[PDB]
Symmetry: none
Subunit: 352 residues, 4 copies
């Protein structure tokens, strides 16, 4: 609780951020009231923050600062620091130095003297910095924020994504805590880690479809008598009707799997059109190969050989760099031939 | 941004607004195409059917930003009223103000006004979400800026090829909603699921990716055929048809450009193409002896064509740095070899051509 | 509150303690989930496990020297009244702690008092049960304690598949804890059988199919021509079918590149036993099938031509095989074919075992 | 593994009993407690002055001093007391009273005393020595059995011959002359991971096929003549050919029932059986009868037998590969049920 709810809030304010802002945490106030008027640790953190500003490595325009005490702490200037946001500050006047300070307890005067001396660090920092209490419900709030803000947020692997991103945030906070340099965690590194975490689980090399059809189904038996324009091409090559059942099965399962895989975001229309270009080239190779080898034969025999050689060869192709079953590669050839694109018969162009 | 996709202006502005929402449904446009005034015909048929979808439970008015697009902005006091009115007091004051402007309309559009005036609380909720945008010249440049700033984890290395795919997904939705005249519905949950899968494709280093778009009608393929280089001549000794010449000139150009792109990106290394070519030359050495054994007696062109087809079938299976390459790479590498006269198809290609 | 993996809290707090133990120390585990502070001196559920814990000592199957005993409450069941057993690690202090329990037991159970009658009969042995039993509670942040102890205590911990190793190893502990709970056997877990399971998940999730070897030897090399002029048995086998000199040179290149990589790089990424001697058997079956196909298809020719076609068919076929599920290049397959052809095991000529 | 230097078994034993964190080990010099050449007191603060100089891991480094000989003194035993909070802090003030060698010849740098005079670690770190005895091969062999979760006693070398090779290089080839050993225990266990995985893996995925022409459960299968053996009798195969048909059916029969007990495959499979391999057989049935005509009938059945055998080793089993025995053995499992046939007249005969 003391160490675990200090990284839910940084993740919750990093998830609701752009791809350019750098958010700096402070991991302060480990214990009267925790936040007093002349809080030496708060002025030390302010001095370190502004010394990080004049170092030149950190942008001032798009950097958000925070304070985390996980307690109300009942202070007036702490509420003033939590409050005056951009513009605001009653009516403007960002030159609000020595307001209700009045030089208390001059033991370490260097922090307030350096804060009052500088003019570029006593002015847009407070309007961008806000202070937030603990209010522990943060494993629920961050879980809601991930599914609300992140486009394409995975919900099945929700706990296995949200664990190592908190581990990365904890590792960054700890490694920046040993070196004593605040924390200059940027949203670009957080975004790269989140993208790698999601793309680890978004890896797949086989697209699975449940081939539960059969030769005795109603829709398979209708297409033989309906005769669409791929069954019509097989009727000139004198193939037996035993092939025409799984010819109609593979065509019906190719259209049923295209709409299934598209709706899950796996494939789209460009990827199936590329897959309908790779198999179209494969038909062009075996077309001239069979005419080369089996020359001087009747066209019923040559037309049958082109169907068999194109069935044993198109099974090696991939869709979205993923392996597909034999039903998809067999059935796409018929769905090519439906709009008269490829032909098993050598004279299918002027006969259909 | 890939400006070339079959580009339209209406697809950039949808994708920018889709990539600014928070996991909530976006209605999208109806293409209203100053002809659009307070008295208008094509405007009121668009808003009339929108009232039926609210009461049917198809969409919820709370988690929906309502948005319409015109290619050129039209000056109309009715249309600018709902674009600024997003509060409760603005929506209530605009229902009477609009109806006092379009009072006593034409009977062809009075039925559209009757469907809009069927309720009060449901009518003002559509006003409170309605926003009106217009086209701009810098439409693809705003998409590159919005991708690299709103997206935690934007890939800054192939985002010219990522955004070809995600614009074509939006293009496929808008085309599908235009073939059958049904109003568009696109959900940001389904938008990000394809967006999360395009970004996860260009992150795995085990796969070799290339944007395959050259075709037979391109200028480079015709110029390469008419230039007559070394590999087209070797294709011409064995007397192939023009289609094989076209596909050879296609495959060689995409193989060379893929070699250049993958070398200047960091995916493949420098010392892999030579080992790939040693593998393919060993394969050609096997198939030469095989075809010369199996085709004794037949003329030289038949043996050469048989060897070409056998090599075209066989050299696909090879790997480039243990990564899977496509058909175009393994088919254009043979022609790049034939450019340097390493491998050949004719049995006496060295004697016939110098 | 930490993120989870999808297992119950009775397995995250057992696998953490099972990882911390030695290789010769068993763990007895029990679950107390009867249920506010409900547990007291008269709750018979604690003495139900205690009677079972005591007659197992008389069984002798469980060693009594070094075995740690555990009972688990699924949440913090607070204000434990038998905590003197847990908070005592000294055997000399456990002697007076045994009769301290007997002071607070007083009157036994009215009808199930046999749990306590067998308890007060082995006092000298029961002092060993004091230091070997400790109270364990549901920590709340259960998966952020087993994952952290894996990254600290286990030597050679893999950080690449750590979230997926952790899924499988808790599956074995859940198999022991739950599938052996439908029948009420003695719920003991030996730590020697932990490391067989953990040493197989770690070993299986370390192999890789990037078996690779940079083949730099070319035709312009003195060892290739030296092996050609030397003429070993496989070169003599190639000479029976009158092969060209270029194929002879590539055969010598493949043989040297396979002989320099079969075992020479610390057995490569494989083992000698039943990987190469299985690869050789697969290639011999492949040669037999191709010999049948060649001698069946082209009936009637001079024997050099059918030998050459058998060589080319074997060359085109044997490149598909794997060396214990790894992708292996063509030079290895051709060199393995020539190495088996060296020992007269497979031959291209139809009369290769008679002429030589 | 037994024959090497005796100052090697103590190094790997201490690294064996350690965590993955606190993974820095230090080992360094080979009555001699303060001699003229000072080659035991060169190290004692100069080598860990790099802790103050700005090196990493300054709180979890464990040192080793003695190598083979047992020597008795007062300063070393006073500094090597218990490592408690108050006990370590009082060591350095007690050191300077009983030094018995305050000469600047051995205090060449002389700046460490002032520096190290601050508390505990700051003045006195955790310098502890362990000397080598004659049973240091026996102590390594016993501790690897006790502490390593998964010690391989099957191979009988106990995974210490090859880790003796790796731990010899850090002392010899990585000493870097006058430099600390500074051995990291993170890659010590990683190097232990490769040697352990090299010999533990006996079986990986496939069942060990041992049935090969040894004439039991294979030659016994031929004589009683089952269905798939009977199909090869009409096509007139040789006597050698029937052996691997009976061989490949037997290991296929063991592998189908063994894989489902361990939850590798399911009965929601056998889509590999009849959806794919029967469709594979159907295409090769029509391919043989197309081009190979005008031939004897018994030649056709072996022709389809060969083309089925070269093609069925492509289909995966629940997105996993299978061996050559499975695809050539499942082709006889359905021929046992007369699903397929090598001869065209496989229905009217049997």
């Amino acid at each position: 609780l003391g160490y675990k709810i200090q990284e839910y809030r940084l993740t919750q304010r990093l998830l609701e951020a752009n791809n350019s802002s750098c958010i700096g945490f402070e991991i302060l106030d480990d214990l009267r009231n925790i936040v007093s008027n002349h809080s030496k640790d708060l002025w030390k953190t302010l001095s370190n923050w502004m010394d990080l500003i004049d170092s030149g490595e950190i942008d001032v325009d798009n950097t958000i600062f925070l304070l985390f005490t996980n307690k109300r702490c009942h202070s007036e200037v702490l509420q003033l620091l939590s409050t005056s946001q951009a513009t605001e500050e009653a009516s403007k006047a960002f030159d609000e130095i020595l307001k209700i300070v009045s030089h208390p307890s001059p033991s370490i005067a260097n922090y307030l003297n350096n804060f009052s001396k500088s003019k570029t660090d006593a002015c847009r920092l407070i309007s961008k910095f806000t202070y937030i209490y603990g209010s522990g419900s943060a494993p629920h709030d961050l879980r809601e924020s991930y599914k609300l803000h992140r486009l394409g947020a995975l919900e099945e692997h929700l706990d296995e994504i949200m664990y190592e991103i908190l581990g990365w945030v904890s590792d960054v906070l700890t490694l920046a805590a040993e070196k004593r340099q605040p924390t200059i965690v940027r949203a670009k590194d957080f975004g790269a880690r989140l993208g790698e975490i999601e793309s680890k689980y978004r890896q797949k090399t086989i697209l699975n479809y449940f081939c539960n059809r059969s030769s005795e189904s109603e829709d398979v038996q209708n297409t033989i008598k309906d005769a669409p324009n791929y069954i019509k091409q097989l009727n000139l090559i004198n193939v037996d009707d035993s092939e025409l059942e799984e010819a109609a099965i593979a065509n019906l399962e190719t259209k049923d799997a295209v709409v299934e895989w598209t709706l899950n975001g796996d494939v789209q229309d460009y990827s199936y059109r590329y897959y309908q270009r790779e198999l179209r080239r494969c038909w062009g190779i075996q077309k001239q190969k069979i005419h080369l080898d089996f020359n001087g034969r009747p066209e019923t025999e040559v037309g049958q050989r082109l169907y068999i050689e194109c069935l044993n060869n198109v099974t090696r192709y991939y869709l979205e760099n993923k392996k597909v079953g034999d039903f998809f590669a067999h059935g796409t050839l018929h769905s090519m031939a439906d709009k008269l694109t490829i032909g098993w018969h050598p004279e299918f162009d002027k006969k259909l």
